[PDB]
Design a protein around this ligand. Structure first.
Ligand SMILES: [Mg+2]
Ligand SMILES: [Mg+2]
Ligand SMILES: [Mg+2]
Ligand SMILES: [Mg+2]
Ligand SMILES: [Mg+2]
Ligand SMILES: [Mg+2]
Ligand SMILES: [Mg+2]
Ligand SMILES: [Mg+2]
Ligand SMILES: [Mg+2]
Ligand SMILES: [Mg+2]
Ligand SMILES: [Mg+2]
Ligand SMILES: [Mg+2]
Ligand SMILES: [Mg+2]
Ligand SMILES: [Mg+2]
Ligand SMILES: [Mg+2]
Ligand SMILES: [Mg+2]
Ligand SMILES: [Mg+2]
Ligand SMILES: [Mg+2]
Ligand SMILES: [Mg+2]
Ligand SMILES: [Mg+2]
Ligand SMILES: [Mg+2]
Ligand SMILES: [Mg+2]
Ligand SMILES: [Mg+2]
Ligand SMILES: [Mg+2]
Ligand SMILES: [Mg+2]
Ligand SMILES: [Mg+2]
Ligand SMILES: [Mg+2]
Ligand SMILES: [Mg+2]
Ligand SMILES: [Mg+2]
Ligand SMILES: [Mg+2]
Ligand SMILES: [Mg+2]
Ligand SMILES: [Mg+2]
Ligand SMILES: [Mg+2]
Ligand SMILES: [Mg+2]
Ligand SMILES: [Mg+2]
Ligand SMILES: [Mg+2]
Ligand SMILES: [Mg+2]
Ligand SMILES: [Mg+2]
Ligand SMILES: [Mg+2]
Ligand SMILES: [Mg+2]
Ligand SMILES: [Mg+2]
Ligand SMILES: [Mg+2]
Ligand SMILES: [Mg+2]
Ligand SMILES: [Mg+2]
Ligand SMILES: [Mg+2]
Ligand SMILES: [Mg+2]
Ligand SMILES: [Mg+2]
Ligand SMILES: [Mg+2]
Ligand SMILES: [Mg+2]
Ligand SMILES: [Mg+2]
Ligand SMILES: [Mg+2]
Ligand SMILES: [Mg+2]
Ligand SMILES: [Mg+2]
Ligand SMILES: [Mg+2]
Ligand SMILES: [Mg+2]
Ligand SMILES: [Mg+2]
Ligand SMILES: [Mg+2]
Ligand SMILES: [Mg+2]
Ligand SMILES: [Mg+2]
Ligand SMILES: [Mg+2]
Ligand SMILES: [Mg+2]
Ligand SMILES: [Mg+2]
Ligand SMILES: [Mg+2]
Lengths: 46, 271
RNA sequence: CGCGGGGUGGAGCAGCCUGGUAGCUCGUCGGGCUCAUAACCCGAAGAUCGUCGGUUCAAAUCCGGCCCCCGCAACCA
RNA sequence: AUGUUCUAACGUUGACCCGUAAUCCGGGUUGCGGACAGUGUCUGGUGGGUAGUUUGACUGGGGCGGUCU
RNA sequence: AAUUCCUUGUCGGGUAAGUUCCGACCUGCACGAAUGGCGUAAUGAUGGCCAGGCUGUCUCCACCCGAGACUCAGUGAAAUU
RNA sequence: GCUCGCCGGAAGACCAAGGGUUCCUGUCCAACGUUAAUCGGGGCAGGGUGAGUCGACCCCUAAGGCGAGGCCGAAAGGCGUAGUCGAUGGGAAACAGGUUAAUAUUCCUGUACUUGGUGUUACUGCGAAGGGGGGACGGAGAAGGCUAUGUUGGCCGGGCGACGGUUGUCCCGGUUUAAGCGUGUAGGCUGGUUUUCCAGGCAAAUCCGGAAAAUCAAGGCUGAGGCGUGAUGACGAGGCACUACGGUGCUGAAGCAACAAAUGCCCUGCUUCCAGGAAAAGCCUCUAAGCAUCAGGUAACAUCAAAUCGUACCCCAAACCGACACAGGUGGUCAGGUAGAGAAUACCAAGGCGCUUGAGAGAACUCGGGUGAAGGAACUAGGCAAAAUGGUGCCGUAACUUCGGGAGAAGGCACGCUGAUAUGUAGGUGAGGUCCCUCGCGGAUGGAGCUGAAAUCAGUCGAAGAUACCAGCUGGCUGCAACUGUUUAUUAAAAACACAGCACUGUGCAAACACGAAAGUGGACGUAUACGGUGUGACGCCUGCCCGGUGCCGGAAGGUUAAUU
RNA sequence: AGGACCGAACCGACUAAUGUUGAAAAAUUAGCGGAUGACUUGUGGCUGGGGGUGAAAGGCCAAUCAAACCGGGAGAUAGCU
């Protein structure tokens, strides 16, 4: 039976990618928090 | 004409269709078409702002000439056509200079008829004149509200307005609703009633026929829960309250017109 | 099991609440009018107020018990 | 105070011209309205559309009934 | 009565025997006219009842074919305490 | 290796998504694999993905996004014009054979095609951010013409049979070939050509649209398939030689016809209906400004270029989504035989598998099935479950009805095989031959050959002929809802929701209404025969009385009454 | 012609049995409904939490819904265990 995660690379990048984060100030704030914490993988692009 | 279907299935028993044999059967005139994709009742926020709209058949917009501002050049009706965007039929006319245009088809118009607009046009159905040149008592349609703006009143199938009086710079009109309204006498009007007067005798016959026109189902307020509608709730069928809209406004009698700009032009309300 | 309202000429209703006094319509009885009856007109009679106790100078009336009458409630279980 | 007229504020989701290669916007001409409409402050009415809350205790279990000095 | 408490009302039909069913009666605790009334052909993985066929549903179980259960070798949990 | 079993509209073969080395070779077996493992999608090492034509990238746009200025907003920001992005759609071009352990429309062989640059020659009006054409579009239905494909015959090679027969109407196998190029056929659409003029296409136009003459009556466009070539080639059964036993090398016959035939192609066609069926570019054409013995355009030839990224492998799955090597889910394409209406079902082909614990035994009891004396719903809340019916053709079929239905009502009869009618019929297809002409992929006649039901009569076997698989139980009364639909993903599918129809009511357009501090947007590029809200719910017969209460609508004399003064 | 009929693919989910530390955090087996349409499906897009969407069940909004999830106020408060 159909589960919730149906992978799609294009939709993944368009929803959570780097350029989607950078497009709004709240996305940029997400990136700032993740840099301050020190995540190795900053977004889903990597 | 008006044709009843034979009851060979439960979805056909009550269907009444209006069929016109004189409508064109080919494709429409390509230079006068545009696309118009559907909204779903959604506005630019993406929210539903009008309910019960969606789906239906794909349609192409026919550019109809509502202004009729090509004066002094006679035109000939080429063919009547079906228009999916409105209840009336539209006629394709050809001007003596080689230009083609769509107009609302008045009652009695047929291929080969002569029409023309302007102040000197003859008093015949399909001709457009400023309303100060049309005799008092005439039946006109596609009436303008501001000079040069384009016709806006009496555009549905079978409708018309009547010029009841003329006094100075204004003419008094009787609209289909029964309201008596005052309009500038330089506005244009087209003589005669809008054609396809039997459009209202149509019976859809089944739910799908309404879904083909992009109408989605209406859920009654009493069928919901109180969190959804003021009418919701109850053990069994309970109403016990004054009828209102989904947003709490009384919906049987309460008047909603509030416009003081245009109150000066209203001579009588429709009653 | 429990609350609320009632019992007044023969019938249906007032008067009770602020205890001093019983009214209204119909019915009954007597007389008229009519050939006669009904209708109509005139006059009169008729209830000690469910019952038993209390309070009071005085109880249909206020308080209590009892006998009937009606209504409501009797849920979660 | 009311009414009538006017135009110059103001409106125009009428027409035309320009920026312009543009059904936004702005500027210009003209028409139509016109001190109305509309907006700000103050103010009466309405307002489960929305919001914050209250809705007693005793009790041979609680409710109903009764009670509370 | 998808509504009737008393109630398995009463009468009729069906059954050997029918608190259900069908037809009536009217005493409607507490139906009723677009929070529609009364009918209604066709339709329904809809509710109730009856009949024919059919049968291991049952009287009342018997035998048989396979997968486990049982024994041997290998691997090897769990709730609980 | 030989037997046996299973799938075969998949449990075979490919694409897309998704994964990312799982692909191939050598080696190892500690851990992983529900057991052992010498094996593995495990560990370690090495190898492997080749493009002008496939895809991306590229040009073009849809929904939608972003959005210079702009409008609007306490700030953050919201919306939107010019623009610019965004495929799931439009736009140039390649096929066959061979080859690796692992890639191939990419490598090799053969044969092709497209776009662009440059140069030369010949001729010449070129030119756009503008005009026009085109691209360019629905559902259903009906054929007619074909092919893929299959069957049979012919031909070629081989065989003469473990047990009765088998030199023949016998058995096995093969009988294949592309793009391109040339023909322009079945068939579809459309009259053509030349002048003259014109309020139209924002200006111009020789282009498109319109008008009037003259003339000719055939021109044009599209088009599957066949045929010829490609191809004296390649491939090819099978032989002959090596094998270091996985296979390598050489050679290589026939390679035809008839019939049947798609859900594929002609066909973006045709017919019909209403619910009336993208856009933009590439492309063709027209001119403006401009240029002008230039530039540019057209044609032929020569030459150069076509970059970059993907390409292994899985892909109804042990590699994707489900924590698992998980009875689940996952879009598109291909589509053999016999029977059959069929992509159902049964047995098979090509191909692929036997599902990663076995061995015994033959207790109760549980699960999944088979059969059952006599009875036949007595069971039970209830015929739950099971049993039963089940096909085709013909006969026959009630109440009721909205005249369509009910209806497959109910019920019944025939059904195999063999022969004859008829050495194979009615029908379908169709060669040769002959005769014509605008001569060709032509017309007429002609019928050899091939294919071929259905029926009747007669006979015949069995208990049984729709023999398996497959495949309605039927009728009677009644409540509710008209009906097809929808719903509580995961205890409720209904009488609930919806519905066509009905009524009330609001709404005159900058509409009411809704989303939004606003600008705006939807309603609607709609205009009262329209749009919103509410209730009822096909259809038939109907829908009675009450305006005291509450609400709404209208009124505006009087009483009361805010800020203000 | 048809929200026509019978019936596979496909989309559902009416009944029964099994399973219930399952093969499976909703399935399997045998039957069952629709199956040219108010049909189904791929890819992309839009609507955001007192908000959306809802042929309406308080259904659905990532196994979570009479108010999602994550972080913060925060060591909320707890006459209670
Ligand atoms: Mg609506
Ligand atoms: Mg409606
Ligand atoms: Mg409900
Ligand atoms: Mg409410
Ligand atoms: Mg009720
Ligand atoms: Mg009530
Ligand atoms: Mg007397
Ligand atoms: Mg007294
Ligand atoms: Mg509240
Ligand atoms: Mg608080
Ligand atoms: Mg208490
Ligand atoms: Mg009872
Ligand atoms: Mg009886
Ligand atoms: Mg009865
Ligand atoms: Mg009722
Ligand atoms: Mg009424
Ligand atoms: Mg009803
Ligand atoms: Mg149904
Ligand atoms: Mg053991
Ligand atoms: Mg343990
Ligand atoms: Mg098999
Ligand atoms: Mg391997
Ligand atoms: Mg070992
Ligand atoms: Mg092991
Ligand atoms: Mg490995
Ligand atoms: Mg856009
Ligand atoms: Mg924007
Ligand atoms: Mg800006
Ligand atoms: Mg682009
Ligand atoms: Mg694409
Ligand atoms: Mg390979
Ligand atoms: Mg063929
Ligand atoms: Mg590959
Ligand atoms: Mg396994
Ligand atoms: Mg699996
Ligand atoms: Mg699927
Ligand atoms: Mg099969
Ligand atoms: Mg056994
Ligand atoms: Mg058993
Ligand atoms: Mg049996
Ligand atoms: Mg036997
Ligand atoms: Mg038996
Ligand atoms: Mg027997
Ligand atoms: Mg019994
Ligand atoms: Mg019993
Ligand atoms: Mg059953
Ligand atoms: Mg059975
Ligand atoms: Mg009943
Ligand atoms: Mg229904
Ligand atoms: Mg459920
Ligand atoms: Mg608007
Ligand atoms: Mg209703
Ligand atoms: Mg159907
Ligand atoms: Mg079906
Ligand atoms: Mg569902
Ligand atoms: Mg269910
Ligand atoms: Mg099933
Ligand atoms: Mg059906
Ligand atoms: Mg509820
Ligand atoms: Mg959920
Ligand atoms: Mg809350
Ligand atoms: Mg704090
Ligand atoms: Mg705490």
């Amino acid at each position: 039976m159909k589960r919730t995660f149906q992978p799609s690379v294009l939709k993944r990048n368009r929803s959570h990618g780097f350029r989607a984060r950078m497009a709004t100030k709240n996305g940029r704030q997400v990136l700032a928090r993740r840099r301050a914490k020190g995540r190795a993988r900053l977004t889903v692009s990597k | 004409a008006v044709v009843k279907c034979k009851p060979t299935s439960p979805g056909r028993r009550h269907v009444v269709k209006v069929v016109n044999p004189e409508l064109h059967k080919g494709k429409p005139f390509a230079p006068l078409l545009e696309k118009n994709s559907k909204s779903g009742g959604r506005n630019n926020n993406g929210r539903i702002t009008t309910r019960h709209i969606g789906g239906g058949h794909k349609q192409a917009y026919r550019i109809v000439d509502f202004k009729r501002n090509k004066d002094g050049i006679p035109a000939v009706v080429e063919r009547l056509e079906y228009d999916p965007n409105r209840s009336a039929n539209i006629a394709l006319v050809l001007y003596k200079d080689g230009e083609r245009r769509y107009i609302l088809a008045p009652k009695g118009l047929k291929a080969g008829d002569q029409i023309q607009s302007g102040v000197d046009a003859a008093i015949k159905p399909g001709n457009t004149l400023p309303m100060r040149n049309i005799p008092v008592g005439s039946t006109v349609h596609n009436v303008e509200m501001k000079p040069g703006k384009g016709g806006q009143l009496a555009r549905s199938a079978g409708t018309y307005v009547q010029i009841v009086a003329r006094d100075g710079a204004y003419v008094t009109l009787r609209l289909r609703s029964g309201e008596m309204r005052k309009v500038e006498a330089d506005c244009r009007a087209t003589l005669g009633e809008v054609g396809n007067a039997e459009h209202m005798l149509r019976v859809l016959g089944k739910a799908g026929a309404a879904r083909w026109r992009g109408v989605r189902p209406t859920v009654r307020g009493t069928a919901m829960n109180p969190v959804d509608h003021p009418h919701g709730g109850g053990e069994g069928r309970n109403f016990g309250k004054h009828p209102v809209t989904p947003w709490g406004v009384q919906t049987k009698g309460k008047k909603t017109r509030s416009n003081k700009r245009t109150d000066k032009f209203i001579v009588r309300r429709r009653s």
